[PDB]
Amino acid sequence: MDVKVQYLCENTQTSQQEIKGKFNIVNTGNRDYSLKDIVLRYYFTKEHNSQLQFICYYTPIGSGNLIPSFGGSGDEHYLQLEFKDVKLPAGGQTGEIQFVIRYADNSFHDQSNDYSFDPTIKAFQDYGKVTLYKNGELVWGTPPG
């Protein structure tokens, strides 16, 4: 599969109450796909026992089409995004998917520990520290060690 993810960092503050940024999924090949087959991961370390919340402020694909969860043990720890059946035509792109992560109890989080955190990227760039998997196979990026 030829698909990549672009990343944009919105909240660049090291210590804060929310991780915030944007993903853009792009189809770089000649075949049509569906987002239902794509799993996306953004890696960060969970330092508090509080329940985590994912919030999508806005997306063109529509936010009802996101299937968010959390997983791993830090930092293999991550936010995972899955998707309902949303077409990604060959050569096409989702456009922005805003993501916010907070602790339910509004605790602070240190981003300097997060594998996928890169405040130098202030506009969408191909970004390899956020991963895409298709049916369990890693097709884009590199996971943490």
UniProtKB/TrEMBL annotation:
Residues 2-145 form the CBM3 domain. Ca(2+) 3 binds at T45, E47, D110, N113, D114. It comes from the Bacteria. Belongs to the glycosyl hydrolase 9 (cellulase E) family. This is Glucanase.
